[PDB]
Amino acid sequence: VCYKEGTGPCSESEEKACSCRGDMQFKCRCSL
């Protein structure tokens, strides 16, 4: 799951891109 935490989730170009940090087992953050 990738969300921008503002103005909804990440863009289609953003999730395809994912700069973006995240939690373990892994700009708008992506996590489990």
Round to the nearest angstrom and report the end-to-end CA distance of the chain. Answer: 6
Cα distance between residue 4 and residue 14, in whole Å: 9
For the beta carbon of residue 28, count every other beta carbon within 10 angstroms.
21
**How was this one solved?**
cryo-EM
Nearest in space to 19 (alpha carbons), one of 30, 32, 7: 30
Cα distance between residue 31 and residue 22, in whole Å: 6
2 and 27 Cβ atoms separated by less than 8 Å: no
Nearest in space to 30 (alpha carbons), one of 12, 16, 18: 18
Run of H or E residues at 30 = strand 29-30
Question: Exposed, middle or buried by CB within 10 Å (0-12, 13-18, 19+), for 2?
Answer: middle
For the beta carbon of residue 10, count every other beta carbon within 10 angstroms.
20
* Resolution of this structure in Å: 7.2
